Amino acid sequence: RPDAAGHVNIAEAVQQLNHTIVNAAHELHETLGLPTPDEALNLLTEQANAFKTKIAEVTTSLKQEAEKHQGSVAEQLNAFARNLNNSIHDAATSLNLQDQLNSLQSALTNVGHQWQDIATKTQASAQEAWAPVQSALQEAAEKTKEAAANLQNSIQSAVQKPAN
């Protein structure tokens, strides 16, 4: 199909970021074995703490658009943006030697699942639906993606450093 009829664009566009977060999310469990089944949390926690606050800056970019005019329709999306601050607030806080990796994959994936919600609304409106979010999501997907690159970079750089 040609881009799925044509209304599909944000779900397909954001999908490019999903390939990144899913990679680092799976690498987090792979790096956990590199050092030990406990101390490894330090490598993930140190990196996850940067991505946790980084989303706070990216999520604000979405609600920031509602402080000019989008706020009318954005009001429903404002509930989706705040959910990210709640997911990151408790993404790297549970350090019970299991919540770090479990919360990281659920946290990094949370932004991917939450974006899927609005990515679908474009199918309903199509013309105006993406217009206001295109600037907030396109500018947030690039900033959140940059955080995933540096995040996986440590996990991939720490696992490749020793190599067997």
What is the Cα–Cα distance from 73 to 155, expressed in whole angstroms?
A: 39
Report whether 143 contacts 51 (CB < 8 A).
no
**Amino acid (1-letter code) at residue 123:** Q
Q: Report the topology of domain 1-164.
A: Four Helix Bundle (Hemerythrin (Met), subunit A) (1.20.120)
Q: Which residues, 6+ apart, have CB-to-CB distance to 38 below 8 Å?
A: 97
Method: NMR
Report whether 136 contacts 46 (CB < 8 A).
no
Element (H, E) at 135: helix 130-160
What's 34's DSSP letter?
Answer: T
What is the Cα–Cα distance from 9 to 7, expressed in whole angstroms?
A: 6
What is the Cα–Cα distance from 133 to 120, expressed in whole angstroms?
A: 12
DSSP secondary structure of 89-129? HTTS---SSSHHHHHHHHHHHHHHHHHHHHHHHHHHHSSTT
